Amino acid sequence: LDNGLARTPTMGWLHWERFMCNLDCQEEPDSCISEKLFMEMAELMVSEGWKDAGYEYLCIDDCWMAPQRDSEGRLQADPQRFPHGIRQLANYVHSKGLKLGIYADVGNKTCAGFPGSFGYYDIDAQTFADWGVDLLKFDGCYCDSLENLADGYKHMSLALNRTGRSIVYSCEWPLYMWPFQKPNYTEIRQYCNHWRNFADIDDSWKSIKSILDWTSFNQERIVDVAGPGGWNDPDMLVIGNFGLSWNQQVTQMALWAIMAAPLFMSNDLRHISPQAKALLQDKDVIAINQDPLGKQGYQLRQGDNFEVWERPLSGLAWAVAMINRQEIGGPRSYTIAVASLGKGVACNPACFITQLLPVKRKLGFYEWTSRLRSHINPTGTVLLQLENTM
Amino acid sequence: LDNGLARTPTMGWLHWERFMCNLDCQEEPDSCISEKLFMEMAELMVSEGWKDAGYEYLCIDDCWMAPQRDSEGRLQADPQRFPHGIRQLANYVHSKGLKLGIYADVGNKTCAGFPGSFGYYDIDAQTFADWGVDLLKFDGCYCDSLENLADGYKHMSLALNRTGRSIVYSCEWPLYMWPFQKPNYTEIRQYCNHWRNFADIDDSWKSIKSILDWTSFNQERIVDVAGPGGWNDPDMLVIGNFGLSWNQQVTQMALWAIMAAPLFMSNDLRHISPQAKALLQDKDVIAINQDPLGKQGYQLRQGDNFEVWERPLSGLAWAVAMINRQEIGGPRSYTIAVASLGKGVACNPACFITQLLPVKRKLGFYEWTSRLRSHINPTGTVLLQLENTMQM
Ligand SMILES: *[C@@H]1O[C@H](CO)[C@@H](O[C@@H]2O[C@H](CO)[C@@H](O[C@@H]3O[C@H](CO[C@H]4O[C@H](CO)[C@@H](O)[C@H](O)[C@@H]4O)[C@@H](O)[C@H](O[C@H]4O[C@H](CO)[C@@H](O)[C@H](O)[C@@H]4O)[C@@H]3O)[C@H](O)[C@H]2NC(C)=O)[C@H](O)[C@H]1NC(C)=O
Ligand SMILES: *[C@@H]1O[C@H](CO)[C@@H](O[C@@H]2O[C@H](CO)[C@@H](O[C@@H]3O[C@H](CO[C@H]4O[C@H](CO)[C@@H](O)[C@H](O)[C@@H]4O)[C@@H](O)[C@H](O[C@H]4O[C@H](CO)[C@@H](O)[C@H](O)[C@@H]4O)[C@@H]3O)[C@H](O)[C@H]2NC(C)=O)[C@H](O)[C@H]1NC(C)=O
Ligand SMILES: *[C@@H]1O[C@H](CO[C@@H]2O[C@@H](C)[C@@H](O)[C@@H](O)[C@@H]2O)[C@@H](O[C@@H]2O[C@H](CO)[C@@H](O)[C@H](O)[C@H]2NC(C)=O)[C@H](O)[C@H]1NC(C)=O
Ligand SMILES: *[C@@H]1O[C@H](CO[C@@H]2O[C@@H](C)[C@@H](O)[C@@H](O)[C@@H]2O)[C@@H](O[C@@H]2O[C@H](CO)[C@@H](O)[C@H](O)[C@H]2NC(C)=O)[C@H](O)[C@H]1NC(C)=O
Ligand SMILES: *[C@@H]1O[C@H](CO)[C@@H](O[C@@H]2O[C@H](CO)[C@@H](O)[C@H](O)[C@H]2NC(C)=O)[C@H](O)[C@H]1NC(C)=O
Ligand SMILES: *[C@@H]1O[C@H](CO)[C@@H](O)[C@H](O)[C@H]1NC(C)=O
Ligand SMILES: *[C@@H]1O[C@H](CO)[C@H](O)[C@H](O)C1(F)F
Ligand SMILES: *[C@@H]1O[C@H](CO)[C@H](O)[C@H](O)C1(F)F
Ligand SMILES: OC[C@H]1O[C@@H](O)[C@H](O)[C@@H](O)[C@@H]1O
């Protein structure tokens, strides 16, 4: 989407995976979907170095709305859970130097069953702009036709543009189209800043694997379309929660960087391990994800339960990820000719190789003739940066 | 098995999950199956508090054998990877105050393809005893005859007995019987100190779940056969490795305690986090596993992606484990009347409840009519100890 936004993949925090549709503020006041929750996260995004690391967008997902539209037929935030309204919340978020994301749905209802935007795209877009919203996630539930789907995503895209406010536009368009009809990505990109291709992530290694496998299986279709202003969205970062081992968290961070994926954390910033925090704030890894060239990486090799992925970067550099998919035994040895990496240019005549994950270590100079050798932990990833020596 | 051994579930370390059949000592010297690996593991068992915690048995799994038997028809340790032989390794292990486990197979080959013990049950038993072996794990590969399986397992049991040496006998008998007919556990219990019921564990939450679900699905068949001298074996502890989140590791430790499981760590004692070590050496949790009553626990309740398991303990005490099986969102509250716990006996007229996992916390006195309220992390377990009391 040519709106001057998402020139690098959007980075922020989104409530859905960790906090879901918790409306029980009586029994669970500290984790229900409320104005307070977003205030608390805003404060920590500043005080705990998240904004400094590039996480800029504080995003509301589903279950923020009142059950009905107001008298003027506009969306409204829940009167008890969001007693000050969205506009006021955006004022607060802005005063912290952050940006506010919100959520709506192309169909008749949101996925959790709250008011949909079908029939209201222009007023809903204007309402969002009026509130000072900076990002819209636009889900695809309760849409009865393939035609209504396309038209709705296009309509809303154009409606947000006419507001005059810069609003990042996140689309679930391809995901809800897929079962019926294969997406036209040139079309989607024309209308959307990023787009969800695959099923909702959850707090599990199974989930990470299936998303990786979905992406690599479909990489002929989706890799080349991605670029500044339009990204594939493999869903939220779930690092800092409950279901991933340390090595699996490293894999998600490493591969979301390879995939030039938007980085929306879904976690509890009030309760996060030092290790998870340092990985999520990893400067060198964020820098790969945020590479200004914006060329999405891809799976290069698969065999013997290893995967090799690579991504071209600015200034003749490359990122390389090596995953161990064998879920038994110990760290396994993997070797590859450096001449096989970066299409044969990364290390011609030579390259300097720095390992970034699981830990930062300079590996040294590698000749065109060289072989790269690593031990990779089960379900873990080794992430390397290669700098050509001119 | 009435040999006076495994009166509580056996505790130790077994190489298989973490090291498998790595024969490449040239290119993978640190993880290949060698005598140096076992020597070094023995040293760390002592120096790092593992033996103190109760982990006594250093166990060799598959892939220690030379390709062929010697001129006397006896098994031999691989000469390149075990140049000093098993006898000298057993000596080294005993001199650290530990015991040595070894591995063989009922069939013509071990699962990895090395010499089987069929036709050699008595000499192999004697060989191990001469070598100073204290435990035998006996696998079921390359034996496609139900009769030979049963006969070989029974024979090896009696063969070990006749050596006069105390040897823990670990059987994969019920697992390799599954494809043919349901196992007779009275028969197995008579011949074995513990027995593997289900497929090999690996380093994954998926594998933990499948083992738990297999156990609870089959509980009416396996729970009551367990007791001092004979345990169900749900396979190795894989805490300290790579594939389990902290909460998932807590789940395994807790539930292996509920199940009165043998505790065989399969990990690298040279490279293990302080958190995984603290969990594996948790004295209160180990005490539940090692409870003298030796009554296996069971799944009490299941629904809404929750599981409640409990185990009766010595002196009218109970362990209760609450599992959250929902793999999305955050901690979920679960409430239960304490009257429903411990067959209504644990907290009559009252009980003192101490949380053991994920952290140790005293929860206080609970009257028989009162309710217990917890929050459980996705894929995590809350482990509680209930002490029957007349007070408050
Ligand atoms: C509603 O929709 C319209 C149309 O899609 C959007 O308009 C686009 O807005 C973006 C960002 O403002 C424009 O991109 C910028 O254009 C500047 C000049 O462009 C000229 O040259 C191009 C050649 O391709 C012509 O198409 C165009 O007509 C102009 O003659 C550039 O100077 C900008 O450069 C930026 O990037 C460079 C390098 O990366 C940096 O040095 C600078 O910092 C700078 O930011 C940039 O390319 C785009 O041209 C507009 N398209 C059209 C067709 O007009 C609206 O933004 C949108 N409105 C809202 C509110 O969403
Ligand atoms: C080869 O196979 C044989 C046959 O199984 C094994 O011999 C058995 O060994 C066990 C364990 O050593 C013996 O069990 C012991 O029995 C003794 C009781 O004998 C009498 O007295 C008691 C009263 O106390 C009566 O109840 C009973 O009916 C008898 O009349 C006890 O002294 C032992 O108890 C102690 O240890 C046990 C743990 O095993 C504790 O629970 C007790 O509290 C106590 O401390 C014990 O129970 C059994 O009798 C033997 N069976 C036979 C048929 O002889 C060999 O051990 C085995 N050889 C090997 C593998 O080395
Ligand atoms: C949103 O819903 C409207 C309203 O009709 C609904 O759908 C019907 C099939 C039935 O379930 C009713 O109870 C609902 O109220 C949809 O508009 C209708 O569309 C159909 C064809 O799709 C058309 O024949 C009718 O003229 C429409 N009805 C009205 C009231 O105008 C609309 O398609 C839905 N939008 C999306 C994106 O799902
Ligand atoms: C272990 O193997 C022996 C040897 O026989 C082998 O297996 C046969 C099926 C055949 O493929 C031969 O070429 C192999 O050498 C088995 O002992 C035999 O048992 C069969 C009964 O099936 C009997 O007819 C033969 O007389 C036996 N042969 C000998 C050498 O005594 C034995 O069954 C195998 N043991 C186990 C536990 O599976
Ligand atoms: C995929 O969608 C794109 C955009 O809607 C289509 O590209 C347009 O094609 C028409 C002619 O058919 C041209 O007039 C435009 O210049 C194109 N626009 C863009 C953005 O390049 C394309 O036709 C579609 N492809 C398929 C296979 O349906
Ligand atoms: C179980 O097997 C043993 C054989 O040792 C036998 O005593 C018993 O009757 C068997 N039980 C059943 C139900 O077959
Ligand atoms: C849409 O459904 C839910 C919201 O109910 C969630 O936002 C998910 O990621 C979705 F697919 F975008
Ligand atoms: C038998 O197979 C392997 C050895 O190759 C391993 O020991 C496993 O746990 C088994 F099932 F006992
Ligand atoms: O489902 C609960 C039941 O499970 C059995 O296996 C156990 O032996 C019983 O004591 C228990 O009441």
Side-chain angles (χ1 to χ4, degrees), chain B residues 335-351:
Chain B
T335 79
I336 191 161
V338 296
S340 303
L341 273 18
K343 321 206 101 63
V345 172
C347 306
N348 196 130
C351 61

Side-chain angles (χ1 to χ4, degrees), chain A residues 203 242-243 245 248 327 329 333, chain B residues 17 28 203 242-243 245 248 327:
Chain A
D203 201 353
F242 308 99
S245 73
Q248 289 147 15
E327 308 190 13
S333 167
Chain B
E17 195 287 321
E28 300 296 320
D203 200 354
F242 308 97
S245 78
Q248 291 154 13
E327 300 192 21

Side-chain angles (χ1 to χ4, degrees), chain B residues 56-69:
Chain B
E56 177 63 19
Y57 288 84
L58 182 65
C59 303
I60 310 165
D61 208 281
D62 203 349
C63 312
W64 63 270
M65 297 167 183
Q68 304 289 279
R69 300 178 167 265

Side-chain angles (χ1 to χ4, degrees), chain A residues 200-218:
Chain A
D200 298 1
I201 200 159
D202 61 26
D203 201 353
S204 77
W205 168 238
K206 171 176 189 177
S207 176
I208 302 299
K209 283 191 287 180
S210 80
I211 293 170
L212 289 178
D213 290 342
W214 276 325
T215 302
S216 68
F217 194 78
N218 290 301

Side-chain angles (χ1 to χ4, degrees), chain B residues 219-327:
Chain B
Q219 72 180 10
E220 295 192 344
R221 302 160 72 85
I222 65 168
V223 164
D224 289 336
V225 310
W231 312 99
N232 287 300
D233 184 359
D235 214 353
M236 295 159 278
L237 294 171
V238 297
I239 299 159
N241 297 311
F242 308 97
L244 299 186
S245 78
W246 152 258
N247 285 282
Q248 291 154 13
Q249 299 173 68
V250 166
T251 291
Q252 189 186 34
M253 194 68 188
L255 269 292
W256 265 235
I258 295 290
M259 290 184 301
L263 301 184
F264 294 103
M265 302 182 290
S266 198
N267 54 22
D268 194 336
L269 298 184
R270 312 164 298 177
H271 316 285
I272 189 161
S273 74
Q275 300 80 15
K277 175 188 183 185
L279 180 59
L280 285 165
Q281 299 187 347
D282 189 313
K283 70 193 166 197
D284 293 318
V285 181
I286 291 177
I288 288 170
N289 178 262
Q290 293 291 287
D291 186 72
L293 221 213
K295 195 98 205 48
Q296 178 159 340
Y298 50 86
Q299 189 190 71
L300 174 67
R301 292 194 173 178
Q302 190 189 233
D304 193 27
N305 285 313
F306 284 113
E307 304 188 35
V308 181
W309 298 54
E310 67 187 4
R311 184 190 169 174
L313 308 176
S314 203
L316 312 172
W318 267 264
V320 182
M322 296 170 287
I323 313 165
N324 181 8
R325 290 284 298 262
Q326 190 172 293
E327 300 192 21

Side-chain angles (χ1 to χ4, degrees), chain B residues 16 61-62 103 111-112 137 139 172 175-176 196 200 236:
Chain B
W16 186 252
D61 208 281
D62 203 349
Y103 167 108
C111 296
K137 184 183 169 180
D139 215 336
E172 277 66 66
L175 169 63
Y176 288 87
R196 280 270 312 279
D200 301 0
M236 295 159 278

